């Protein structure tokens, strides 16, 4: 079997990418954020706090004839942005793209934290990370992809997110013709559950490429791209009036300017971020400074290939029994 759906950004500034999932019998669609980077797949729901509904689309599993409760099980997450959700679980059909999965844990929300209240675009999270992550408890739970991996005619799925523009995830199957050149694989360590590889170095601009090993994970529910502080350094550095702010959260650029692109290496390949995708606009309306997209990792404890990074590559999430990552151009 294989699955495609559409990704589509939330916003003009691509702040993250909504796919429509059905759940239940007969269907319910709602718009999950996948998240390469968690491992629950938990939704918006009739038993959520009322008061923390504010017009995402619920899941009511009374209404769906193929829903069970999962019997004693909960969750409970909390991810890098200090962001949160926890509830009870129900089994269910899902289905993304065409392929469907049957008795998918879809993890019901009672409560979610206010970034979830505020974004009314985003009904909930599919994790796509290694369900050693998965929150379930007492007994841990699959994702979506490792219930699906058995059926697909590969056990791959991969990421085709826009600049600006709608993408594609497809599950099962590598379309050849949705990128250019070839693809470059590389090794993955799943020690911490994620999609974990090491860049090979980086470029700023038109400047000298810089052999230098960055480990990292492809995290498709990351915004932005977090590097050490002394690449991001080196990048603003190259932007006149560039500045990290500790009162905005980060490197903050003149909305003037024009920024140079950023190279990241895949082996002995080159994955070229376009200057434009690293503008996130205005910090506050009508302001004449503007947010970077390319920020330290120093009070992560991880590098963080997100969706800046990610939306120029076309990629290749292989989940074979040893796992690697391919990122080709596009």
Known sequence: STGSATTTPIDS???????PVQIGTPAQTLNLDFDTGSSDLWVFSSETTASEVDGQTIYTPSKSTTAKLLSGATWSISYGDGSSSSGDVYTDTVSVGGLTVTGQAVESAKKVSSSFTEDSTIDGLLGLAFSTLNTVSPTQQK??????????????????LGYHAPGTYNFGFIDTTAYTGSITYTAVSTKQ??????????A????????????????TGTTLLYLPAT????YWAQVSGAK?????????????????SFTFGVGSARIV??????????????????????????????????????????????GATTPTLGFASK
Do not use: M, R
């Open 13 to 19: 500034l691509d702040d993250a990418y909504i796919t």
């Open 231 to 234: 690449v991001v350094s080196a």
């Open 273 to 318: 971020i376009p200057g434009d995708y690293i503008d996130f606009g205005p910090i506050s309306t009508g302001s004449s400074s503007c947010f970077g997209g390319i920020q330290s990792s120093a009070g992560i404890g991880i590098n963080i290939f997100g969706d800046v990074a990610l939306k120029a590559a076309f990629v290749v999430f292989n």
């Open 143 to 160: 994702t979506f992809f490792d219930n699906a991996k058995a059926s697909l005619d590969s056990p791959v799925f991969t990421a085709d």
């Open 244 to 260: 990290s702010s500790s009162s905005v959260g980060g490197y903050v650029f003149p909305c003037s300017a024009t920024l140079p």
């Open 193 to 202: 559950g994620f999609w974990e590889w090491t860049s090979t170095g980086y």
């Open 204 to 219: 700023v601009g038109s400047g000298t490429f810089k052999s230098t090993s960055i480990d990292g994970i492809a995290d």
